[PDB]
Write a protein that binds this ligand. Structure first.
Ligand SMILES: OC[C@H]1O[C@@H](N2CNc3c(O)ncnc32)[C@H](O)[C@@H]1O
Ligand SMILES: [Zn+2]
Length: 349
């Protein structure tokens, strides 16, 4: 009984937010770095979330383990290879992982992250490491996996570099650019750095996706679509507040990377109101189901499917339909995208 026992497509999930508590414990002791706990169980209760907190409160959880990974090549390549394994077990045939290359490096990064000590793992180096562990997992488990480099809202100076990384690793797993981080930061979507990086992505052919509407107003989503020129909208739950902007995005067939369990734990979705995804399922909108950060939300792709099934009354037909759309909205090249749609239709028969 796993809600939807059929191939799936995940377009929204962060690598640094989907690491096995066991691997975190392994590198914590191997490098001698402190950890909130010394047990996979207790470490799960410290990093994991039980009740709804907030976007700034959920983002702090990363501080507990990111230092144990960042800086180590062996750890960056391993978490990428294990990520594929996880997705292969959940029944996901195609996936798009996203992460901030700068948050995992300890060299050539202005504001050094996690108070690290200068080393040699450059940002361009973490993109290559992740490409290797992701490619190895593809041959060992049998699933297609592409990546997405993120732009941190609070750090616009890194953006232009994220764009160059997308151009250099184009198709070599990297298929797009994203803007994640603290959406509560006022005007973080208009910071010249971000705006310039997305302007170059539009003229260079780099795909785009922007975290918006998760906790901000409809104006933020409007800026990601009009000024940043996104091809997708991470979350976008608050878009319905602006009837005009929502119906316009509904006509343009804008994709909405939805994350149900995540919106409840971050406060992005008030539990006393109907979830936006319900309105999406009713309006036949383009959207996909995702996990966002399984490690911190103590969840699995099935969690979200079981949440929409029991609550919100989602049917298998809707599951096959929202997955066919995710495959159509994926940043795969035409040929590969056709192959994906050919496989799903064959398995959905
Ligand atoms: O994975 C890249 C970065 O994006 C941020 N993430 C993760 N999850 C997440 C959420 O969906 N909303 C906004 N930003 C997010 C984390 O800060 C992480 O370090
Ligand atoms: Zn996200």
């Amino acid at each position: 009984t796993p809600a939807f026992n059929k191939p799936k497509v995940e377009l929204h999930v962060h690598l640094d937010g989907a690491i096995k508590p066991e691997t975190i414990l392994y590198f914590g002791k191997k490098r001698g770095i402190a950890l909130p706990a010394d047990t996979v169980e207790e470490l799960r209760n410290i990093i994991g979330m039980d009740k709804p907190l907030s976007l700034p409160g959920f983002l702090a959880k990363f501080d507990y383990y990111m230092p144990v990974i960042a800086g180590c090549r062996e750890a960056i390549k391993r978490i990428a290879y294990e990520f594929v394994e996880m997705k292969a077990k959940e029944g996901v045939v195609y996936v798009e992982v996203r992460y901030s290359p700068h948050l995992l490096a300890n060299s050539k990064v202005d504001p050094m992250p996690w108070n690290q000590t200068e080393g040699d793992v450059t940002p361009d180096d973490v993109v290559d490491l992740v490409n290797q562990g992701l490619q190895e997992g593809e041959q060992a488990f049998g699933i297609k996996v592409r990546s997405i480099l993120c732009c941190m809202r609070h750090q616009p100076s890194w953006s232009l570099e994220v764009l160059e990384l997308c151009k250099k690793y184009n198709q070599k797993t990297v298929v797009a650019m994203d803007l994640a981080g603290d959406e509560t930061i006022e005007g973080s979507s208009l910071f010249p750095g971000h705006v310039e990086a997305y302007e170059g992505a539009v003229k260079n052919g780099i795909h785009r996706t922007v975290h918006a509407g998760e906790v901000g107003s409809p104006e933020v989503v409007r800026e990601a679509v009009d000024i940043l020129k996104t091809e997708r909208v991470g979350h976008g739950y608050h878009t319905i507040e602006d009837e005009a902007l929502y119906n316009r995005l509904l006509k343009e067939n804008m994709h909405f990377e939805v994350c149900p369990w995540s919106s409840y734990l971050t406060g992005a979705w008030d539990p006393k109101t109907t979830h936006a995804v319900v309105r999406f399922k009713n309006d036949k909108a383009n959207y996909s189901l995702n996990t966002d950060d399984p490690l911190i939300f103590k969840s699995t792709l099935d969690t979200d499917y079981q949440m929409t099934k029991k609550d919100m009354g989602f049917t298998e037909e809707e599951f096959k339909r929202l997955n066919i759309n995710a495959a159509k909205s994926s940043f795969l090249p035409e040929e590969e995208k056709k192959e994906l749609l050919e496989r799903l239709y064959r398995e959905y028969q």
